[PDB]
DNA sequence: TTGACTCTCTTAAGAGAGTCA
DNA sequence: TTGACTCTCTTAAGAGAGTCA
């Protein structure tokens, strides 16, 4: 197995490839009708992407490194959490982007929780809007908002009390 | 069936036996610390469901009737919403429970919207506790609340800037 | 050891359609 | 005509693993 000071390794390489990628500055919505700015380290759009990195999917990319002669590959956006729980509440834990911005790799804009969390913060107001997370949200939600819905709940006939 | 007549006898035979369901009183957090007292018409947890209806899978069922000689089959809850636009912004529409109770077919539990706003329904604060919901909620989603991180952002060198 | 592709899978909110009796 | 089963698919937040040079 793969010793303590071979992941913190790992963790170092990744983070001087990602630290290279382009450097992006986007305004973003914090809430409370306030704008704020993120930095995001986008990996390109098509190969090459970076030493170790490669894609396997339209936006799913992986991290490879062989030790020992032994190919050993992550997901890209796990690499930061490699010394942490890997579950909690018996739900896996995943790569959580605080940006929304799926091809960023910034580890500061990263935090690692079960899948329901990670899709809640989609729809959070944001650090000035009243978000509750306690691992708090960089921005507003993308998704935040009245919503559109089409038709709300209505009956014809008299058969339903709410 | 093609005809608007044809729908709302659709709609009113659902209706009819739907309104058959057991009522079933669920006690539910508003947001503020308050609660509230919602009615669900459960489907049967195994068959017979109820005129014109069949489980297709574990918590999915199907509503159909014999028009013209015809079968015509619809997703159950997607019924009161025969008459409305199939789809919004080139998203398509959805049966969407305010009362987060899939059994339940009530129809004043039930609205029509995209997926993403159903889904994000399911972290809102509440009818007593913020939610923008244009169409409101009936109560704050199960999975409202601060989350289970189990790590925030963080990076080991100094490549990385928020 | 490395890059650039290939494939399928998970989850939890939702769907459509076929086989028998 | 109606009932009771069977199967796979959609979405958008996420994954693991194979092949070739
Ligand atoms: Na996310
Ligand atoms: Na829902
Ligand atoms: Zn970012
Ligand atoms: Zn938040
Ligand atoms: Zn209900
Ligand atoms: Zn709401």
């Given at each position: 197995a793969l010793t303590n000071a071979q992941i913190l390794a790992v963790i170092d390489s990744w983070e001087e490839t990602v630290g290279q990628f382009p450097?992006?500055?986007?305004?973003?919505?914090?809430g409370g009708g306030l704008q704020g700015?993120?930095?995001c380290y986008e990996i390109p759009l098509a190969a090459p992407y970076g030493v170790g990195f490669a894609k396997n999917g339209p936006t799913r990319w992986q991290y490879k490194r062989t030790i020992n002669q032994v190919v050993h590959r992550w997901g890209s956006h796990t690499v930061p959490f490699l010394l942490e729980p890997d579950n909690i509440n018996g739900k896996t834990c995943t790569a959580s982007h605080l940006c929304h911005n799926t091809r960023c790799h910034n580890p500061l804009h990263l935090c690692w929780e079960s899948l329901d969390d990670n899709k809640g913060?989609?729809?959070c107001p944001?650090?000035?809007?009243?978000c509750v997370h306690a691992v708090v949200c960089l921005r507003q939600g993308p998704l935040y908002g009245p919503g559109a819905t089409v038709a709300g709940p209505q009956q014809?006939?008299?058969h339903f009390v709410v």
């Open positions: 450097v992006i500055t986007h305004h973003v919505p914090l700015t993120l930095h913060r989609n729809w944001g650090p000035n809007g009243g014809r006939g008299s």
